[PDB]
Amino acid sequence: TQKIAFSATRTINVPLRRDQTIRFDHVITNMNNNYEPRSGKFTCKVPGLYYFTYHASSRGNLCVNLMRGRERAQKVVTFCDYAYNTFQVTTGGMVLKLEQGENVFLQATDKNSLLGMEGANSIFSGFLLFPDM
Amino acid sequence: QLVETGGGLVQAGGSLRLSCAASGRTFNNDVMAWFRQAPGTEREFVALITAGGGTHYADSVKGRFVISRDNDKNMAYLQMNSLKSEDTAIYYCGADENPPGWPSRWSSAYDYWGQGTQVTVS
Amino acid sequence: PRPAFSAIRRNPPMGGNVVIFDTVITNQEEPYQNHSGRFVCTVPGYYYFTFQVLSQWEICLSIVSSSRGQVRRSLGFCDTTNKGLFQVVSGGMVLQLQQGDQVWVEKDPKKGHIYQGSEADSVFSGFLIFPSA
Amino acid sequence: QKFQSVFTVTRQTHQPPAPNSLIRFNAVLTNPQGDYDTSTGKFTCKVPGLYYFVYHASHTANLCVLLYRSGVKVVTFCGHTSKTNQVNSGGVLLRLQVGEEVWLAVNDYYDMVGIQGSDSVFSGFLLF
Ligand SMILES: *[C@@H]1O[C@H](CO)[C@@H](O)[C@H](O)[C@H]1NC(C)=O
């Protein structure tokens, strides 16, 4: 068995600009240490099928790109949720087949209302479903 | 094991850098915290740093202390400025391998400690 | 077998109650049919299914399972914010499936508007948790 | 199978949860190990390891959902609304040992009135 799984929350509240990687600095779980909390990037060392998910607290317009790739990162999907002024939680999820060295991370856009507070968490999680060979 | 170093005698208004060296396992997925104990009162929280570098400070040290860490070298640091006689304490470094989604300021959350280092201010 | 999938909406057949996720991101063992919006079980066991669907007005969605011809509308999830702004309705559940069972996402015809553009995404995902024993 | 763990439970009651109280999901969809107790509202770990917990809660007023682990608050997600139905969702991966307890709770924002056809669900499963 390969146990690869991470859950990480964001506790810094510096404003995100466009195309910045969204860092989840605080590690709840990081089994096999394939999530990098200094960056916010998961890096695949064991190729196979993975599920990635997040829940982001927000007070305004939030759009985030889910990014994937080895060399140049590419957008898989964009998730958008438009709060007007008020506290909300939004979610996105995806099953990805990953090769070795593929990075997976969330990327900021111009709609950057994402907060990390004790009473309104933002969390990024992922786990291996089935390894390869 | 954690080992605190850097303490000693400082004159008030001065600066001091403490170091906490970790060993046994990698601590890159742990919360690191500094606690302090002056004689006569209890172990008060000073500062903590998340795995990825997120810093959180007690109100008494905000604007004066900087907590940092180096995941490649298994090190955590407390850079202290504008030192006052109230900062005289034994300083303790602690690690939490199993935090909740927000890092704790309770001393009972920190599963390993070191032999503290003594800071004496003027 | 490693059954796991994720599909999104980009150019769906617009029609009826079944929410067809036409554009496949992942489809290991090909259990999801992008022509119909239906996951078809080959390996019996416990599966997790989840969706995150984008709406701008009012929507009600259900996760529906069929076994041996008999339909099971298990759980419904709605967003009625009705503001013109991106809202995500999300839901999910564990289902125990036998071979041949089908799973899909249904929309209330009475109350139901899915975003039809490109700039953000709606997702249906599923994967096997444990095979049957 | 006794060496696995999976549940999905729902809440069917007109009684709203009290502020700060545990949310009881009183109706089973899947629970073959009995790991969630629908009369106490608590998961109790039988098989140790890494679990994924996730919920989706329908509400028409302000709701915060808290995940607790043996009396310590793990995560909190909040959703504000005044009349319209929305879904509050959250989730977390936790490594658990035998006898550890997991439940969901509300804080001072406690509403769980969905419109008809909008449900509230809590799921968990052992991953490895
Ligand atoms: C739909 O599925 C077929 C296989 O069943 C595949 O060949 C085709 O590329 C898929 N189309 C899209 C748009 O995903």
Numbering used by the authors:
A (entry chain B): 92 to 224
B (entry chain G): 4 to 125
C (entry chain A): 91 to 223
D (entry chain C): 88 to 215
Give the text the authors published on this PDB structure.
C1q is the pattern recognition molecule of the C1 complex that initiates the CP of the complement cascade. Each chain of gC1q adopts a ten-stranded β-sandwich fold that together form the highly compact spherical structure of gC1q. The gC1q mediates the C1q interaction with numerous ligands including the Fc-region of antigen-bound IgG and IgM. Here, we present a C1q specific nanobody (C1qNb75) that inhibits CP activation driven by IgG and IgM.
To unravel the molecular details of the interaction between C1qNb75 and gC1q we determined the crystal structure of C1qNb75 in complex with gC1q at 2.2 Å resolution. In the crystal structure, there are two complexes in the asymmetric unit with the two gC1q copies being almost identical. C1qNb75 binds to the side of gC1q and is primarily contacting residues in the B-chain of C1q supplemented with few contacts to the C-chain. The paratope is made up of residues from all three CDR regions of C1qNb75. A hydrophobic patch on CDR3 formed by residues Pro102, Pro103, Trp105, Pro106 protrudes from the β-sandwich immunoglobulin fold and is inserted in a C1q cavity delimited by the C1q-B chain loop carrying Glu209B, and the loop carrying Thr102B. Asp75 in the Nb framework region 3 forms a salt bridge with C1q Arg129B, which is also involved in the interaction with IgG. The Nb bound gC1q with very high affinity (KD = 0.3 nM) and an off-rate of 1.7 × 10−4 s−1 corresponding to a t1/2 = 4.1 × 103 s for a first-order dissociation of the monomeric interaction. To analyze how C1qNb75 prevents C1q binding to IgG, we superimposed our structure on that of IgG-Fc bound to gC1q. This structural comparison reveals that C1qNb75 blocks binding of C1q to IgG by steric hindrance, restraining access to critical C1q B-chain residues important for recognition of one CH2 domain of IgG Fc. In this model, C1qNb75 exerts extensive steric clashes with the IgM Cμ3 domains. Collectively, the C1qNb75-gC1q complex structure and the structural comparisons demonstrate that C1qNb75 binds an epitope on C1q directly involved in recognition of both IgG and IgM and explains how C1qNb75 inhibits complement activation.
